[PDB]
């Protein structure tokens, strides 16, 4: 449309000119620009190159400034002008980002126009202290039976998803994002969870298909996607997690609840190792710099749970880590295990043996755990965990086989907590100890359909109360026994 | 011992030697004198014959600075300046002395309070508006300051002007405004 | 229809600034005076 150009793009066009402070590029190389000038530039301030690129003032030196280039240094030549922005590196935050795909600097890459953000937040802010925090109490529901029962995740927690390549880590994160739809559409505004998915070093096609899976499930309406893919500069893959973390700290600070997925942190450590080795810094174990632990720990420390004097918000982080050959005693895996509050070990043996999600229940842990479960899920999952420990000890045995096949789940199928409780109840009271194992899933499917098509009242009572009372206990008992007689 | 820090700081071996010279002269009040001195010695060296005599790496340092002693005792040079050249031949940093001279120049040109301004245009500038914008430029600096305005021309900026006041910088070019308008029209 | 609209808009934008490609420093002096007022 013709006047969509003279709209205000011409009239309001920032055609000002101002007395700016500048520097001159001395030498560009290895993604670092030695810049001459910028006398009053600040440490970690964002500067802008002639080509429209952007960089961060890393090394303030007596005679020059080392600038980390956020992009391809192909677009920088010696002699280019570098302007100050006066703003320490920061990104747009706000609710206007929900539904948008952005790159590590906050620019829209979904072709839907500019983000109408009114607030900017620094990417390198400090995590909250000791007093602002409060213990994790509210559950962060994933919709996966195995996670939500045995490895519960609370709001304000940090839960590692660690495992080899192609074992279902992104699937767990995507199901956790899809599951929050039942809460984001409801009425209680203290159960809404805004999800953020930082994609680092990933294939851009994979991120596009991820955004598609989120749009088909209508999960993009409450989800930010920060994308620093495999072809983007290493500084961008380095920055992306802090951009996403500030976008989530916006919700954490305003009494709302965000969840953030870093997919994955191993690639951010690799990008930071590239930057450090190109800066001639001494390489430690596996050639990683000495401060790769600090790299991940100043980031995963910002996922907190504030108390009711600081808003009562939270920010849950699900960092992803990819191990080689199942080695968890590596450098970066053990770093992030030292930082987080638990793990979800995905195994290749279980994944190849049809057990999907391939969660290793014996090795998966959640240091917070019990403090952030519903009462009904706690009732049934305590007995389930006891019986699973018994089964893995002797690897009763038939009960264990039954339960482990009850833990299998399909992709893009997050179950509500009531239906997980119903299924685990039907599994843990014995009502299929004598059903031979291979039909269990089938039974499970049919059973749940039954319980959702006709006994909606029981599920609603479980939802309201949070616990499965003795009345509802006997009610679910007769329901499952009647179905099993029918089945 | 205390040292007089010049108002500008130059770096490298050139910067260090010239900072030494400045803080030496400031404690005896002989700065413009030693500028004329190093001016003279720079034109001493810029002639090819003993330029090759001194950049020769196959001289013995004693030989080279012996010729330097000779030619520095020729022109009744100040002890400060003879000592500086003696130190540059001692440390073998002689070939870089031009740079040091360079440094010293720049240093005291901010001692006299000069600010270098550079106006790039797309057209060879008129005289009228040249000094017009000179008068305009004058109002930015405190008193005691002198504009070293050197307007070169580049016909690719498509008009306007690009003025650099030291490191301050106004880009009133028309090419950049066209780029900004295009960006706004695309975003 | 909307894709044709977007593509026509794109050709229009690169053509309009080609028009500027084919195409007086009074504004320069005015901006100079403004900056002089900016002190």
């Amino acid at each position: 449309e013709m006047s969509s150009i003279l709209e205000e793009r011409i009239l309001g066009a920032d055609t000002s000119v101002d007395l700016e402070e500048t520097g001159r590029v001395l030498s560009i190389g290895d993604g670092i620009a030695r810049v001459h000038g910028l006398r009053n530039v600040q440490a970690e301030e964002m500067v802008e190159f002639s080509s429209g690129l952007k960089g961060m003032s890393l090394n303030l030196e007596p005679d020059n400034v080392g600038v980390v280039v956020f992009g391809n240094d192909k677009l920088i030549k010696e002699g280019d002008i570098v302007k100050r922005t006066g703003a320490i590196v920061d990104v747009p935050v706000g609710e206007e980002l929900l539904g948008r795909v952005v790159d590590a600097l906050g620019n829209a890459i979904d072709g839907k126009g500019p983000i109408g953000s009114k607030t900017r937040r620094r990417v390198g802010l400090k995590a909250p202290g000791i007093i602002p925090r409060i213990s994790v109490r509210e559950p962060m529901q994933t919709g996966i039976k195995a996670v939500d029962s045995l490895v519960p995740i609370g709001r304000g927690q940090r839960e590692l998803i660690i495992g080899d390549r192609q074992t279902g880590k992104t699937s767990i994160a995507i199901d956790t994002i899809i599951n929050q739809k039942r809460f984001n559409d409801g009425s209680d505004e203290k159960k809404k969870l805004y999800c953020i998915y930082v994609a680092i070093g990933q294939k851009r096609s994979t991120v596009a298909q991820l955004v598609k899976r989120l749009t088909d499930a209508d999960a993009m309406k409450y989800t930010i996607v920060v994308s620093a893919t495999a072809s983007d500069a290493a500084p961008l893959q380095y920055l992306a997690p802090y951009s996403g973390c500030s976008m989530g700290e916006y919700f954490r600070d305003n009494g709302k609840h965000a969840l953030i997925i870093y997919d994955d942190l191993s690639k951010q450590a690799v990008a930071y190792r590239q930057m450090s080795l190109l800066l001639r810094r001494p390489p430690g174990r596996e050639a990683y710099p000495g401060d790769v632990f600090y790299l991940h720990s100043r980031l995963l420390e910002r996922a907190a749970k504030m108390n009711d004097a600081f808003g009562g918000g939270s920010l849950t982080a699900l960092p992803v880590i990819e191990t080689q050959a199942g080695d968890v005693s590596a450098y970066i895996p053990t770093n992030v295990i030292s930082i987080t509050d638990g793990q979800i070990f995905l195994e290749t043996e279980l994944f190849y043996k049809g057990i999907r999600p391939a969660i290793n229940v014996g090795l998966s842990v959640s240091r917070v755990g019990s403090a952030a479960q519903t009462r009904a899920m706690k009732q049934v999952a305590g007995t389930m965990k006891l019986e699973l420990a018994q089964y893995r000890e002797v690897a009763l045995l038939s009960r264990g086989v039954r339960l482990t096949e009850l833990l299998k789940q399909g992709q893009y199928s997050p179950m509500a907590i009531e239906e997980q409780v119903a299924v685990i109840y039907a599994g843990v009271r014995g009502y299929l100890d004598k059903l031979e194992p291979s039909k269990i899933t089938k039974f499970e499917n049919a059973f749940l359909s039954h319980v959702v098509s006709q006994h909606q009242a029981l599920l609603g009572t479980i939802r309201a109360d949070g616990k499965i009372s003795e009345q509802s206990d006997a009610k679910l008992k007769e329901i499952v026994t009647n179905f099993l007689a029918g089945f | 011992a205390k040292l007089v820090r010049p108002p500008v700081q130059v770096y490298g071996i050139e910067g260090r030697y010239a900072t030494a010279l400045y803080s030496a002269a400031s404690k005896q009040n002989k700065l413009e004198q030693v500028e004329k001195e190093l001016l003279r010695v720079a034109q001493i060296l810029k002639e090819p014959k003993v330029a090759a005599s001194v950049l020769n790496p196959y001289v013995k340092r004693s030989i080279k600075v012996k010729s330097l002693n000779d030619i520095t005792a020729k022109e009744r040079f100040s002890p400060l300046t003879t000592n500086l050249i003696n130190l540059l031949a001692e440390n073998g940093r002689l070939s870089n002395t031009q740079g040091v001279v360079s440094a010293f120049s720049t240093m005291m040109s901010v001692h006299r309070g000069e600010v270098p301004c550079t106006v790039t245009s797309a057209s060879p500038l008129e005289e009228a508006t040249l000094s017009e914008l000179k008068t305009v430029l004058k109002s930015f600096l405190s008193q005691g300051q002198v504009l070293k305005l050197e307007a070169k021309t580049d016909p690719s900026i498509l008009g306007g002007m690009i003025v650099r006041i030291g490191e301050k910088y106004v880009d009133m070019s028309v090419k950049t405004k066209i780029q900004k308008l295009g960006r706004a029209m695309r975003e | 229809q909307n894709m044709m609209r977007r593509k026509e808009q794109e050709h229009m934008i690169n053509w309009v600034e080609k028009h500027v490609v084919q195409s007086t420093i009074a504004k320069c002096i005015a901006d100079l005076k403004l900056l002089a007022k900016k002190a």
Binding site: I5, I10, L11 | - | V16, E17, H19, S23, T24
Partner: peptide, 15 residues
Amino acid sequence: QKLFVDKIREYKSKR
């Protein structure tokens, strides 16, 4: 405001 009266001449040309 020379560049707006620049631009809309071109915009009318494109019209």
